[PDB]
UniProtKB/Swiss-Prot annotation, chain D:
Name recorded for this polypeptide: 2-methylisocitrate lyase
Assembly: Homotetramer; dimer of dimers.
SUPFAM superfamilies noted in UniProt: Phosphoenolpyruvate/pyruvate domain
EC number(s) given by UniProt: 4.1.3.30
Positions bound to substrate: 43-45, 121-122, 156, 186, 208-210, 239, 268
Keywords per UniProt: Lyase, Magnesium, Metal-binding
Organism: Escherichia coli (strain K12)
Biological-process GO terms, alphabetical: propionate catabolic process, 2-methylcitrate cycle
Lineage per the UniProt record: Bacteria, Pseudomonadati, Pseudomonadota, Gammaproteobacteria, Enterobacterales
Co-factor requirement: Mg(2+)
């Protein structure tokens, strides 16, 4: 009996409510998240683009850019990884299927696909365009049919709220779930009551994207639990703090000609080694 | 056709010592460029510990490094110096393939060290190094492989802690004699030593000012007085980024919200300016 | 620094028409070089069917192609023309990244076409070609992305078979005006037709002389009389290699030994001479 | 969840000896499957010479091999045995990462050999091998790294040409004792030698029936009589494919047309059938 990351994700959902899922920009951070106690992690599409590629989150990253990060993370971290698969990386069902099979093989526990048109953008940006309900239903059907591991999770994300309104978005959500979506990700929700409306309407686990500096308030896990949201996602939180800290080191070093004044803000060598189990490896070499 | 190696050599001429900062990923390379740096570095310890979440013990492969080189140089135009450990392989063919692949991936130069196969950080105890002759062969193979004459082949020696200063300097002389264009005397403990290496080899000397190791935190003024050509800060940004990430993860887990650490975060606008986001979005909307 | 694109342009002035053969992998690129060819080709159909064992229906990713470009150009010095389909993405950003990535990978040039998604690949006759304006946008994005001025941006049009000769010529003129440096008109069946395109655009014209299709197997003499600048044989060696491989598999399975097909095999020495084996091994023996 | 290694082991019990053919790329893996084979092989000499156009001298990287494993196993369901040379690195950490990475890539098993660093074909002269103790360490590292219990760890020994039959058999016994699940005695020159290895280790034995080397072209009946469980043909199709391609290139260059060699080519309809083309288009 082989281990299923998808089965581990589903199990995590039953043990934590809402299940906190944090984005992990790279393998090192996945280990840090695990050491912090999280039971599930996330590979942000915006993070692969802005972090790994230094590019805008506008459909520029490819399937392989993402697979590279999935392998890096899952090769060392045992926590189930939910992956942002944007629109499936292609214009047809064959592309969606290749995406699902490849991510399962790379080690992911699940993925979400959204209803945006080709060159997608952040759900917290204006002027987004979405495909017809029927088109997304076909994306979803193709994804579910491609599952090689029955416990792998296929989540549907809808960006329809800001575009067509709440009722239209709920209607799409119901159609997406009827089409096979196993969990729902209603993006950029502005009021807590909306999560409850979605939850009651589709009756499958609901994910709340609590990302910073967007259209969504910073809801607490208590508030989210009261609206019956199954998981709380913090997609780029650590990434944002890491960038400010790195920027600070770069500026100080440039202005002062030494990093002495920011040593206090750095993870120590020992803390790094502890994080990656360094001593156990070096001891083996020494012997 | 633009040569990154040529740009690196040029940077050396305009700044002395030339500050070179490690960039863990493409995003940070852009932040380093915006901070004014003229050259950047791809740390082997960072590819291992950061990109792979593994110890810096010769576990990373040439391709793990090539992936990060392309990601960084595809978006950042600053010359990138790359840590190539011992050449990724048992023979001169592996060293040559490493050199040609890194040049093609967009690097400006690389350094190869004299450690045995499963190398370790120059600041760790119990290092093992190959014979002077064996290292000379690795350097000869690397130099002969250059497809871009301006690409830089830098030699690193870890012999100070293993054989002493005089032995380390003798190796450095042999390495440069064999074709190494720049020298990286690892884990120096006293400022005066940099001057001795500089005088002995007559090629640019790089001082590795990494934290929590055997080397004091020398300032650029101090390094300049010792005739150091380059001041390297390999993982400085990475160490701060890790502490900050850990803080966010801990607070979110304990508090059930990130409200209390919002002030420690780069804002969305700052991120967008960093990656030239608005230029791309404007094109799409038009 | 050597420019593959500059080498391709040079080969065009020394041979007319310039024979360009598809090379399915690095080994065959070396065989082509030994046979005397001055330029080679990375077929999109070959990357799909050969490297991935899949149909040429928009399933391959940019990275699948880049891997083959690096393998071939890392060892073979001949200029490599690459099939870049529609740019591997839905926007001008994807086209630009494809161009820059292929240049870095070592290619001498590429051709981009005017189909919608993989609709023409799927043989759909209606609404399968983008508007002239949309293709001009792809071309301008490709040309502006050139990091090496000598890299070649060729335009391929799949319109003759669906819109007629007049429309295909009109598209071709608009494409060349937008920046296309050479033209690849597909589905031509008459020599006179090649001549018409040549006079209409006044840039080098490529004739696709693939087997088992509508196009007759024109000779280089015939093509020269029609003002064709280059003759492409995209999968020729690949087709013969597959029949030979299948034969070995069949004989081995029927007989329990490969004794009877040894005479159809490249000998070990022939392989060694092709990859310069002995010069490498001797260096190892003399350490 | 399906385990490729479990499938490989099952294939052994259903075919005696099990014919394993080298598949240079995903397309040929499908050709092998369509031809009736039950197991396939990813040759290290093929990744080097074919995918990279380079000598089989330890120049290929783990990544070059992983790419080919994913391409083949993403489309072909047959269990794939992979040539892992010496583990791709200088330490047991590298051997362990190779094992884990190949399992994730989709392989059914792999073989690791006892050569020193920059290895060479087992049919080449002057090869060098590590101590029995060092090989034992590589095998222990490999077996302990298995994330799929049914993944197969095969040990290959190049000792016959260097130290003789008895020393090669002694090493083979130490390797199996260390955990090797199957054995690959390379470049055997006499049929009877296979029976000796078979009797000495009690695990499945693989015979490498490659062309133009030190091993006679033994038939599957001969191999079965010597208690050989697997018959490997690592580059057979590749060699024929190369001659065929060379012929096309030469004829086309000399004649200015490929008309005279059309009869040596797989047709487009045959190509489409081998990759299930029309099955795709319709959807
Ligand atoms: Mg996203
Ligand atoms: Mg290092
Ligand atoms: Mg081999």
């Amino acid at each position: 009996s082989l281990h299923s990351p998808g089965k581990a994700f589903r199990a995590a959902l039953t043990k934590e409510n809402p299940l906190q899922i944090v984005g992990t920009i790279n393998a090192n951070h996945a280990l840090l998240a695990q050491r912090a106690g999280y039971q599930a992690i996330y590979l942000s599409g915006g993070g692969v683009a802005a972090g790994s590629l230094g590019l805008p989150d506008l459909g520029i990253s490819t399937l392989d850019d993402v697979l590279t990060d999935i392998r890096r993370i899952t090769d060392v971290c045992s926590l189930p990884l939910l992956v942002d698969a944007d629109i499936g990386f292609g214009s047809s069902a064959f592309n969606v299927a290749r995406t699902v099979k490849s991510m399962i093989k790379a080690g992911a526990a699940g993925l979400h696909i959204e209803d945006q048109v080709g060159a997608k953008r952040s759900g917290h940006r204006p002027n987004k365009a979405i495909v017809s309900k029927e088109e997304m239903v076909d994306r979803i059907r193709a994804a579910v049919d491609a599952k090689t591991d029955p416990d792998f999770v296929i989540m549907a994300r809808t960006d329809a709220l800001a575009v067509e309104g709440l009722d239209a978005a709920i209607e799409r959500a119901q159609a997406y779930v009827e089409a096979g979506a196993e969990m729902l990700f209603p993006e950029a929700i502005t009021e807590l009551a909306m999560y409850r409306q979605f939850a009651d309407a589709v009756q499958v686990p609901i994910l709340a994207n609590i990302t910073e500096f967007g259209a969504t308030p910073l809801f607490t896990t208590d508030e989210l639990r009261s609206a019956h949201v199954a998981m709380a996602l913090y997609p780029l939180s650590a990434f944002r703090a890491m960038n400010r800290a790195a920027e600070h080191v770069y500026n100080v070093l440039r202005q002062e000609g030494t990093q002495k004044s920011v040593i206090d803000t750095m993870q120590t060598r020992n803390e790094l080694y502890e994080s990656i189990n360094y001593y156990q490896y070096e001891e083996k070499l020494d012997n």
